[PDB]
Amino acid sequence: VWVVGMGIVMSLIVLAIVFGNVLVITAIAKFERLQTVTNYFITSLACADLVMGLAVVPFGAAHILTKTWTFGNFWCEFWTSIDVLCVTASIETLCVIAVDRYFAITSPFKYQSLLTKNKARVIILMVWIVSGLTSFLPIQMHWYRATHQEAINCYAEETCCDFFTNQAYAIASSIVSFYVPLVIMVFVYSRVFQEAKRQLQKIDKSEGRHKALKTLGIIMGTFTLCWLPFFIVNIVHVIQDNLIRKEVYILLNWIGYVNSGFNPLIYCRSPDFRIAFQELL
Numbered sequence: 001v002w003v004v005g006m007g008i009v010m011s012l013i014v015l016a017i018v019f020g021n022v023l024v025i026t027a028i029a030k031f032e033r034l035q036t037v038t039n040y041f042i043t044s045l046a047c048a049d050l051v052m053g054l055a056v057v058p059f060g061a062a063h064i065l066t067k068t069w070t071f072g073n074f075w076c077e078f079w080t081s082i083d084v085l086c087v088t089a090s091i092e093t094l095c096v097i098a099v100d101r102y103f104a105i106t107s108p109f110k111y112q113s114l115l116t117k118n119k120a121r122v123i124i125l126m127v128w129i130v131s132g133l134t135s136f137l138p139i140q141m142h143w144y145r146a147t148h149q150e151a152i153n154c155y156a157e158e159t160c161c162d163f164f165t166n167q168a169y170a171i172a173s174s175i176v177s178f179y180v181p182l183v184i185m186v187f188v189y190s191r192v193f194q195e196a197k198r199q200l201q202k203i204d205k206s207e208g209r210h211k212a213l214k215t216l217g218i219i220m221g222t223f224t225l226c227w228l229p230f231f232i233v234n235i236v237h238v239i240q241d242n243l244i245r246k247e248v249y250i251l252l253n254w255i256g257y258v259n260s261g262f263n264p265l266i267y268c269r270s271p272d273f274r275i276a277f278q279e280l281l
């Protein structure tokens with residue numbers, strides 16, 4: 001009575017996640033006007049979100065609904081690695097975009113010298129390499145496996161695919177993926193808001209006879225509310241075993257997934273993008 005319906009919602013989530021990223025990538029690729037040094041980070045983020053939508057969500061939906069993992073253990077390990085890869089890549093791309101905006105606003109004269117079509121590649125490649133190292137190398141080499149009997153039973157069985165992690169890996173992944181980009185983005189956006197306030201006061205200083213608040217608030221609040229609650233229980237359940245149940249953990253993790261769907265709306269709303277979308281259909 002409840003299983004037949006939730007599949008519909010899980011289907012719309014996948015459909016929206018795929019469609020938004022596909023539209024963004026097609027619009028960027030097809031039209032010459034949109035191509036810009038800044039737009040490459042958006043392309044990388046859209047590609048990461050597209051990979052997440054095609055790979056992670058559909059298999060997790062079947063795992064939750066069926067309550068059993070029909071496939072083998074190898075596919076379970078590969079799926080976990082892909083999920084970690086996509087999540088950390090998306091977060092690092094957001095941090096890179098924020099740093100780009102900071103450099104653009106703070107130093108307008110030498111902005112062009114720092115960023116060129118050459119260094120954007122290098123930055124994207126280094127971000128993706130750092131994302132790959134933290135996910136595939138620890139997981140596929142079995143360095144993250146736990147020690148207690150329940151974890152041993154879970155790993156031995158070829159039907160259940162549940163996440164059991166060591167404390168050190170969980171903490172290292174938490175800081176490497178979430179907290180450092182959060183601090184960087186907070187500092188960047190504080191400086192940008194202060195500069196905007198100074199300019200707005202300077203204009204009214206001469207033109208004798210609130211807007212940036214909403215723009216900063218949407219961008220900060222969406223990311224914070226979507227991802228922060230998961231990266232608290234991630235450490236809490238490791239430190240204290242009794243506190244956090246598995247169901248709450250899964251629910252928060254799935255809330256974290258939805259943040260990929262909201263990215264095109266937040267970051268692709270310029271009139272040029274609107275014209276490109278209109279020309280497409």
Ligand SMILES: CN[C@@H]1CCc2c(ccc(O)c2O)[C@H]1O
Pocket residue numbers: 083084087088163170173174177253
């Ligand atoms: C079960 N899903 C995983 C589990 C742990 C984990 C995730 C995402 C980013 C990380 O850095 C992690 O350590 C989650 O998506």
